[PDB]
Ligand binder design. Structure first.
Ligand code: HEM
Ligand SMILES: CC(C)c1ccc(C(=O)O)cc1
Ligand SMILES: [Cl-]
Length: 393
């Protein structure tokens, strides 16, 4: 009853152009079986959303990568939030929610905005730039490590560690095994910075440690929660901002609408997250035999959710393949959905908003003027290089 497909969603062919294969996956049925990796797949919005919103049946504690923690050793100690189920999930989630709250956003907004304005001003002096290295990477590197309260030394390890984390959610292909074999220095750096004495007062890291006396988390849990922000908090935003700039470069009409109303910046970033979905795929593991879209899935089975596909499903979205900065984006799953829905989403949106605001007010045109190069990662979608010419407004 379940169709079997030979599509490898972790192949370079797929990463290069995933959209046709995603339609094939959606149109094959609500649930498919991927023979390449012996996992179930769901690529339609309705089933992805259903799976995300049933954490009892579709759990995270057995890993959200291909590997089943009940069968294999996790490459690093499990995340206390991403790779936990309720009730263990609930208090660490509450702490990170309070750390990355509205009040915190109010304390960092002016600084994030100033840095975004300054970066765009710098880039306009250069005119011809790489929108990845010089903007999508450079801007979050100029604000997030500082907001964490990291020392200056060693920050070159942050993006490699993130690449490793997102590759490690994948199957044991070359991308994954190469990342892990090179991992030791990046892990050593990240783990050390997670300790209380290495995190500057007033930062996100110190704030997590400060919550260790409320009864929500203990002191021994705090380093792993800092590790969650150092895993998830930088490379995601790099690919989100890169997505938005790439979208504005490819859809000049939308850049012109954004210029005419810079208060569209937050939605323009949100629509970039829907349209490119920086985080493409994640797994769950079934805790029982379950019926999903008329198909029966056995206990202890890995289920691959195609978030990018769900965000392009014409069953849910009108003109899904258009970038539309006045689209009603609510309901997209680019930040997940349900109890694990991105706890850093206010930081992500703040970065994206103030950068797109700066572009809207300072830039008249973004023209690609060189070869675009894609970055291949088992979980992350984005570019390696995006040469553009920026015309000042
Ligand atoms: C555009 C940028 C981002 C995207 C697309 C993104 C995407 C996601 C998604 C899809 C999930 C759900 C995972 C799941 O259901 O298993 C998630 C969770 C999470 N994200 Fe984000 N994220 C972004 C930025 C950030 C930032 C900036 C931070 C931290 C400062 C962050 C920290 C986390 C953490 C800690 C979780 C786990 C939450 C939980 O399990 O309850 N993310 N993110
Ligand atoms: C979903 C993605 C952004 C993510 C990656 C790692 C962690 C963690 O290490 O807890 C959390 C979320
Ligand atoms: Cl680690």
């Amino acid at each position: 009853t379940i169709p079997h497909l030979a599509i490898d969603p972790f192949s370079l062919d797929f990463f290069d152009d995933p959209y046709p294969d995603q339609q094939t996956l959606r149109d094959a049925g609500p649930v498919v079986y991927l023979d390449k990796w012996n996992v179930y797949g769901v690529a339609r919005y309705a089933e992805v959303h259903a799976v995300l919103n049933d954490p009892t049946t579709f759990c995270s504690s057995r890993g959200v990568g291909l590997s089943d923690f009940k069968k294999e050793k996790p490459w690093r100690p499990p995340s206390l939030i991403l790779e936990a189920d309720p009730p263990a999930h609930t208090r660490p989630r509450a702490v990170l929610s309070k750390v990355l709250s509205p009040a915190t956003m109010k304390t960092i907004r002016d600084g994030f905005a100033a840095a975004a304005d300054a970066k765009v001003d710098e880039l306009l002096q250069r005119g011809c730039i790489d929108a990845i290295a010089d903007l999508a990477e450079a801007y979050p590197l100029s604000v997030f490590p500082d907001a964490m309260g990291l020392k200056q030394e060693g920050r070159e390890h942050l993006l490699p560690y993130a690449g490793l984390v997102f590759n490690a959610f994948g199957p044991p292909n070359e991308l994954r095994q190469t990342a892990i074999e090179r991992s030791a220095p990046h892990q050593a750096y990240v783990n050390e910075q997670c300790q209380r004495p290495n995190l500057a007062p007033g930062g996100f890291g110190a704030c997590i440690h400060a919550f260790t006396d409320t009864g929500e988390i203990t002191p021994d849990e705090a380093p792993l929660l800092v590790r969650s922000l150092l895993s998830a908090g930088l490379d995601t935003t790099v690919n989100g901002i890169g997505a938005a700039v790439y979208c504005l470069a490819r859809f000049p009409g939308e850049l012109q609408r954004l210029r005419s109303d810079p208060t569209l910046a937050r939605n323009a970033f949100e629509e970039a997250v829907r349209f490119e979905s920086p985080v493409q795929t994640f797994f769950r593991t079934t805790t029982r035999e379950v019926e999903l879209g008329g198909a029966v899935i056995g206990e202890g089975e890995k289920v691959l959710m195609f978030l990018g596909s769900a965000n392009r499903d014409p069953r849910r979205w009108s003109d899904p393949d258009l970038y539309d900065i006045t689209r009603k984006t609510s309901g997209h799953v680019g930040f997940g959905s349900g109890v694990h829905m991105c706890v850093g989403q206010l930081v992500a949106r703040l970065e994206g908003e103030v950068m797109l605001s700066a572009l809207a007010r300072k830039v008249a045109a973004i023209d690609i003027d060189g070869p675009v190069k894609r970055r291949f990662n088992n979980t992350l979608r984005g570019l390696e290089s995006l040469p553009v010419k920026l015309t000042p407004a």
